[PDB]
């Protein structure tokens, strides 16, 4: 059977980056020719692997992580980056082995009055670890007094909304991102190419 990459790339709804979605891909033949022969991607950067030479490799597991961020922020989905997205939403390791794929989705993820269904984490005491997913909504304590789950001064809701409107500049328009992680453990390799 063929790997369900279509379910990830062509999904109707994408996740907010703070609650990024992960699809675990196993026991299937992966046809990567569908991806690198597509003229619909604006970002296609791979680390520790060649895209065209991917059909000749077997891996134990493949992970497909997907979410929506700003075009300004696609540069943060890479090893060794800092910023609100890399620090507090989605973090790649230094030794990352995989591919980061992105494309403009302003036609889908922006509404006339402004789309607010897409959120990102703005406040967090410390940086995320690689592949860490934080979905907490706890009120953030920016000062001395405890918040007790009530908003107010020095007590902020940790998530912020993107303002995706069609009139935004490219760097502020929504982009859908798919991160492929390639994992080679001391187990049977279940994801190969042709």
């Amino acid at each position: 059977n063929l790997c369900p990459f279509g379910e990830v790339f062509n999904a109707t709804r994408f996740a907010s980056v703070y609650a990024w979605n992960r699809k675990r891909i196993s026991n299937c033949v992966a046809d990567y020719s569908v991806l690198y022969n597509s003229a619909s991607f604006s970002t296609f950067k791979c680390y520790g692997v060649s895209p065209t030479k991917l059909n000749d490799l077997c891996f134990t597991n493949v992970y497909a992580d997907s979410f929506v961020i700003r075009g300004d922020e696609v540069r943060q989905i890479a090893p060794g980056q800092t910023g609100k997205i890399a620090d507090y939403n989605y973090k790649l390791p230094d030794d990352f082995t995989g591919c980061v794929i992105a494309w403009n989705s302003n036609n889908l993820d922006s509404k006339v009055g402004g789309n607010y269904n897409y959120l990102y984490r703005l406040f967090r005491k410390s940086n995320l670890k690689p592949f860490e997913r934080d979905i907490s909504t706890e009120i953030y304590q920016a000062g001395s007094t405890p918040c007790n789950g009530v908003e107010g001064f020095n007590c902020y809701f940790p998530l912020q909304s993107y303002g995706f409107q069609p009139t935004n500049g490219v760097g502020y328009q929504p982009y859908r991102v798919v991160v492929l992680s390639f994992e080679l453990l001391h187990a049977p390799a279940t994801v190969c190419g042709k």
Partner: antibody
Amino acid sequence: EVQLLESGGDLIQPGGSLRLSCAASGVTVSSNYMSWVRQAPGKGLEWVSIIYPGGSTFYADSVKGRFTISRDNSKNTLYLQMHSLRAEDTAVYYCARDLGSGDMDVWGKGTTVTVSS
Amino acid sequence: DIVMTQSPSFLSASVGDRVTITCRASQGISSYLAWYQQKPGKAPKLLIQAASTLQSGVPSRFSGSGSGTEFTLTISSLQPEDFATYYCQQLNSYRYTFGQGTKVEIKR
């Protein structure tokens, strides 16, 4: 109450070094987006540097490679270390708390830096 | 990058007037805009964030609105303490870009 008290501004020659301090009360520096913003005599506001609650730092292009922002948790204090100062660095320097998006609600009174030969 | 053009540089108004300051971005920034007020010798004061959220404690006079590429600060009824310089700032940007500032002065 809530206040930011900065100090360390002085008259210094070009190529000199200076450290500005910003002692905070009512706000926890390590838990906040904290920035330095400067204002040259008779000009507008210019953002200088920021340190995220998680520790990441970023700089304006005009000061990159010369200024360093840091903080001391035990002293609840923000710092701006300046090296290789130039005449155009002359300004009043404010420390400010950033609510997250760049909108700064808590400002200090400012400290004055003059760089001249 | 995105250039913030703030107009006018100088504005003369009278006590009780309705004042309109304009900040134009070189391309769409949604609602990512803040407004500041600064008086001579004092630190700036945050008035409105996110283009239409009056900061707590700021009097009801100050009104912020606008979306996309044209934004406005509106002082519905100018009071003596409102003669000052006002600054817009692009929010959620790598550059933290400020406008050039608008000085509101006493009409005669």
